[PDB]
Amino acid sequence: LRANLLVLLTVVAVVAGVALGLGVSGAGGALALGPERLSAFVFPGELLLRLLRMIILPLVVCSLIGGAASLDPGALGRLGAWALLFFLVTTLLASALGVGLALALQPGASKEVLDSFLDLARNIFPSNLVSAAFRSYSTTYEERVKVPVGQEVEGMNILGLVVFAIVFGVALRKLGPEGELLIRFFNSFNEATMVLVSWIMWYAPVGIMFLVAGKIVEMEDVGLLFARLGKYILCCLLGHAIHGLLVLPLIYFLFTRKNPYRFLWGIVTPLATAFGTSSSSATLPLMMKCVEENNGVAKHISRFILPIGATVNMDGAALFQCVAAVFIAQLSQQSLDFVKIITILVTATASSVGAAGIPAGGVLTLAIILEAVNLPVDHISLILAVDWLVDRSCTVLNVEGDALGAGLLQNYVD
Amino acid sequence: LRANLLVLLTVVAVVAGVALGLGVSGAGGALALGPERLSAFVFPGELLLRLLRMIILPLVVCSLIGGAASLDPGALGRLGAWALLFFLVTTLLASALGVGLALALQPGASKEVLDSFLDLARNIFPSNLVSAAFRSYSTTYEERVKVPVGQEVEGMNILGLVVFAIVFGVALRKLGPEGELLIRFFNSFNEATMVLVSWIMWYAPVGIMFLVAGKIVEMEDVGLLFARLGKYILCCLLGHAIHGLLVLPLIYFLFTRKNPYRFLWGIVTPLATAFGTSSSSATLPLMMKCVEENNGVAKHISRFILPIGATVNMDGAALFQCVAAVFIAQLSQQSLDFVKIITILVTATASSVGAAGIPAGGVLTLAIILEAVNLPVDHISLILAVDWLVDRSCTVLNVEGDALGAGLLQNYVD
Amino acid sequence: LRANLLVLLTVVAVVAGVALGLGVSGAGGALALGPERLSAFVFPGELLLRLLRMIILPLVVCSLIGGAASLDPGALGRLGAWALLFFLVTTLLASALGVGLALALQPGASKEVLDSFLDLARNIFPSNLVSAAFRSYSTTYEERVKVPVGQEVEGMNILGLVVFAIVFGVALRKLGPEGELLIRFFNSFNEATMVLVSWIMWYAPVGIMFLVAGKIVEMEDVGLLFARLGKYILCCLLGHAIHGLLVLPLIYFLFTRKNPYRFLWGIVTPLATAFGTSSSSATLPLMMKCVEENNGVAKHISRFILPIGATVNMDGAALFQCVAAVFIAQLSQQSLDFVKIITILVTATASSVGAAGIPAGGVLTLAIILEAVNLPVDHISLILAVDWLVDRSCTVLNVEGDALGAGLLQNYVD
Ligand SMILES: NC(=O)CC[C@H](N)C(=O)O
Ligand SMILES: NC(=O)CC[C@H](N)C(=O)O
Ligand SMILES: NC(=O)CC[C@H](N)C(=O)O
Ligand code: NA
Ligand code: NA
Ligand code: NA
Ligand code: NA
Ligand code: NA
Ligand code: NA
Ligand code: NA
Ligand code: NA
Ligand code: NA
User: Fold this and answer.
1) What is the CA radius of gyration of chain B?
2) What residues does ligand 3 touch, defined as CB less than 6 Å away?
């Protein structure tokens, strides 16, 4: 079976890439390779990333337009309400789990908040669709007292495109016969993009191998990081594993009484792609393919939930942010009252939506939680030493939550 | 009736926003609110602006393609000739009225001209459509003697998109059966964008309220501006009122013997949206909706004239530019001969086309008239103190001229 | 016949533009005209360039999608293999001819190579289609040892768009009935863009006249250039003439036993447009029109080969690069062994693909050959004095090779 062959090839890609990176580092790593030969060594992973980012846009737009135009606006609204409830509850549970793990294990033994949320709202409503295709609104500060002035910076505004696609699909549904032509157009475009996804899946193993090989070759050494941040890394990774292997599967089983680990086997490939790429947006294409044809999720439910979740639902990001907040508080020996914990949870849950879903997109918002909850911000300099791995662990769970919620809402629809 | 309800809500939005801004300023204004809370206070207006600018592009492009493909190229050429004649004559009349008011009341008691027009011509023929969707060609100067070097700067090139849409629609018409598919596609897209416009119209009241509230909260105080520029403000606003309430309605009545104030009631909402947003491009979406369904203008005539006029026809801009030129000449006590007045009129009429139709887009060209007609340029520093209001007054009349010309050409077609 | 009238008008445009430029230079040139009047003088050529660049994008994309969707993937693969073989062989022959001419006549009596090829590969796989529509990936260097860091710089990524269009057309072919709607859509769009091309062809004469008039008016004087670079100019131009009038027609005749000069008469107009614009991308629109309706090349074969070749096949560029390499080696009296010559040929052939097909796009890569083959790079400062003409001579042959290969593959298909 080609699906099992692809899954095996992706697992072997991850393992052999770890092995190749370890062997290259033992042979000297970047210093032995040199900057030019190092850049040439990690290139296939960059090609995989580029290939995925090339199709993020048309796939997301067309799939969401078709999905929103495939349902009654009332039914679509109810489905979206349930999906948002599931996303929010899972993110809150991940935040609480992260805080609890950080408090129990005790691993620790900028932009304004208002400006961050206003930028979120601005990106939700893009001022230009073509610009939104490759730029997002971001606020910097001038001194005149700090005055916030904003501009469009590099980075696809996936959130604004998602919102516009949903709204445009609802409009097409409202049109009736006149909008059917555009529905057919976008469905055909999405099917072609899905064919491209199927072709890119076969290159995904090589890209993942080289991604992981380069990222572990880029390290100074395992000891230098772990001897100082081992308990923090353990907190983050263990929370991710508990949420993805126990909590989320538990919820799926209780609401969808089917074997969740079969569902996870059906998406092993996009999970490894998320680990390799460290971005939910780039692995979303593969996740949609697998969830549609490897599992029994309906086409419209998948194409409506997965793209929305990949931008709004981020359980790993919230867990990492809470663990980081508690770790920084413990480093400074700051007291954490119940109000303080609730504030951490709420701020992490709210910022997870604003996370751009791109590599190193959690540290940008971590300062927001460290500001809402007054804590030393400079200590983030430590987290960046291990963010290259915690971010991948976060992306894995982030896309896993999307897939499991899509399955759960498929069961609810059925 | 929902139309009358929306009109009443928009009028109440303008009035209550003025009241809210006055109350906030009396309570202290920005200093009492603070920069963060001020930014949060004016946000809904920015959201309305973003929502409108999001749909300017697809609406303009699809509507113009469909309109140009809906008529015989000869009939389309005759319609465009009549529309251009009407626009030019109305702009010349506005320029003459502004000059006459400035001379009678006597309120006054950079980029090269060639480079400005070459940039206009370049933007008319965009070098890239995707870039034109969010950028426009602009010329800066290097010293080597000043050499003009140009680049693409932020700002949608609505003029180039309009020209390309008209040309592409004519091409589709030339194709015949083969082009009908694209005509259907663009008509469906425009209808969906019009549904989005209908949804945005219901948020327009809140956005307008907050826009006006913030803009009058941003003031230092009414006295500081008026005690020095009251007669200039009076000249500009009175010329706008005379042109929009007497001259343009008079022309509409003589050429279209119907009550023009009923037509103006049919578009009160986009007029208030223009006042709030200070941009003809952003209020064009709402103007098209109203002119199509609130008045009896045909679909093709509206979708061909309104988008063209919103970029080419600007009577308020020309009136303001002439009043500013005469005001600056009177400040410096410069003599204005008949040749001088004719030059002012011609330059203002020509630059009105080049005006980008965006907030504060008239002061950019005012220097062009002050250069063609040698006058002190530095004095523009005064006008910027009141441009926030004169520009809104200009945009109101600018969109009003579009609507009335669309009605007049509808009568001519009938 | 309108075709012969257009050809005559374009030839007269070239000749009369040379005459006008010579007359203006004799009257003083830029100094007599002045910077403003000079900028106004050369404007029509810039308008022609903008008009062509406006349609490069939709034309290339839609034509390639339709062509790739019009053939069986196996047949399309065989056609592409033959086209690539022809392109590579012709480019190698041009490189060898340039090297031989430089060695016989002896006219001579930055970015890393790996980074250049990695940028080529990145542009082949664009990370964003909207960004690719007007930007291309380029690598600069930071000092930390030089570390290569890359970003998107201005310039349409025609190569990535070509690859994506071919892949998307193959995907549409794979879809079957569901993809036929998109095939029809893109065919209609390409036909409309071709109508626009037909309209732009009639303005092409004026633009070409003013282009050549300005470019020869921009000169200091013929003597200052020729008295020092005459034999190099002769080598380049004579190699181009030999390849375009003897070698390429010879190959066409042997593989397609028809009069090649009739085929060249059929494309005289795009050849002169290439000479005037100095860009294969901008003249590709006209070349497609002529090759389709002036000669007997099939629609799909043209729309598949011409856009691919205009980015991949550049015989003139390779010839110029080889002549420049040998000229610089002779200036420094560097020995050229057989290995050295083979390296020059291979590097020029490989870099010709990476050439962006835009004015002055050969000198960017010339340093790549001068680095792979260690030679003084500074001497390129001389070539820039004559690149304005050699680049045009290169573009002529570059598009001529595309047209002749399209005809040859048409014969092969027949
Ligand atoms: N730490 C995080 O989860 C940041 C976002 C993550 N890189 C993603 O794309 O899902
Ligand atoms: N003063 C003016 O009229 C400038 C243009 C105006 N802001 C508009 O968009 O119509
Ligand atoms: N010297 C060259 O051939 C560079 C590329 C050339 N300007 C073209 O577009 O074909
Ligand atoms: Na969640
Ligand atoms: Na997600
Ligand atoms: Na998010
Ligand atoms: Na007018
Ligand atoms: Na207007
Ligand atoms: Na204008
Ligand atoms: Na070749
Ligand atoms: Na070519
Ligand atoms: Na090339």
Assistant:
1) 21
2) C 278-280, 314, 316-317, 320, 355, 357-359, 361-362, 391, 394-395, 398
The radius of gyration of chain C from alpha carbons, rounded to an integer in Å, stands at 21
CB atoms within 10 A of CB B100: 17
Closest CA to A405 of A240, A260, A262, A275: A260
Residue C169: count other Cβ atoms within 10 Å of its Cβ: 29
Per-position DSSP letters for B79-142, written without gaps between them: HHHHHHHHHHHHHHHHHHHHHHHHHHH-TT----HHHHHHHHHHHHS-S-HHHHTTEEEEEEEE
Tokens read off for B12 = 């109440």
CA B411 to chain centre: 24
Contact C138, C119 (CB under 8 A): yes
- Residues pairing with C36 in the sheet: none
A205 within 8 A of A12, measured Cβ to Cβ: yes
Q: Length of chain A in residues, anyone?
A: 414
Q: How far apart are CA A330 and CA C191, in angstroms?
A: 67
C-alpha distances (whole Å) from B196 to each of A24, A170, B190, B294, C335 are 56, 9, 10, 17, 70
Residue B10 in 3-state DSSP?
helix
Distance between CA atoms of residues B97 and B348, nearest Å:
12
Contacts of C150 (CB under 8 A, 6+ apart): C119, C122, C137, C138, C139, C140
Cα distance between residue B372 and residue B359, in whole Å: 24
Domain count, chain A: 1
Chain A residues close to C130, C-beta within 8 Å: 57, 130, 133-134
Q: Whose CA is nearest to atom 3 of ligand 1?
A: A317
Given CA atoms B353, B356, B359, B363 in this order, what sign does their dihedral have? negative
Q: Tokens in use for B257?
A: 């013997």
CATH number at residue C231: 1.10.3860.10
End-to-end CA separation in angstroms for chain A: 27
Q: Which of C125, C129, C175 sits opposite A192 (nearest CB)?
A: C175
The two three-digit tokens of residue A319, written as one number: 């867990």
Domain that holds residue C315: 2-413
The alpha-carbon radius of gyration of chain A (Å, integer) is 21
| CA contacts within 13 A on the Cβ side of B285 | 30
Q: Give backbone dihedrals phi and psi of B150, rounded to 5 degrees, phi first.
A: -115, 160
Query: Nearest-5° angle of CA A99, CA A369, CA B29?
Result: 150
Distance between CA A156 and CA A280 in Å, rounded? 13
Cα(A340)–Cα(A27) distance, integer angstroms: 48
Q: Please list every residue in chain A followed by a chain break, i.e. its C lies more than 2.5 Å from the next written N.
A: 109, 144
| Residue A237 neighbours by CB distance under 10 Å | 18
* CB-based burial, A280-292: b 16+ in 10 Å, e otherwise: bbbbbbbbbbbbb
How far does the centroid of ligand 1 lie from the alpha carbon of residue A187, in Å?
Answer: 29
Length of chain B: 414
Give the closest residue to B151 by CA, choosing from B121, B124, B119: B119
Chains touching A (3+ CB pairs < 8 Å): B, C
Q: Is C309 marked within a binding site?
A: yes
Rounded to whole angstroms, how far apart are CA atoms A83 and A120? 20
C-beta separation of B21 from B212 below 8 A: yes
User: B253 is written with which tokens?
Assistant: 């009545």
Two tokens, residue C368:
């790549």
Q: Which of B369, B359, B372, B368 is nearest to B398 (CA)?
A: B359
Question: Do residues B341 and B122 lie in contact, with contact meaning Cβ atoms separated by under 8 Å?
Answer: no
CB neighbours of residue A1 within 10 Å: 6
Contact across the interface for C53 and B128, Cβ inside 8 Å: yes
Closest residue CA from atom 3 of ligand 3: C317
CA atoms within 13 A on the CB side of C151: 8
d(CA B400, ligand 8 centre) in Å: 7
B87 Cβ neighbours under 8 A, 6+ residues apart = B309, B312, B313, B401, B405
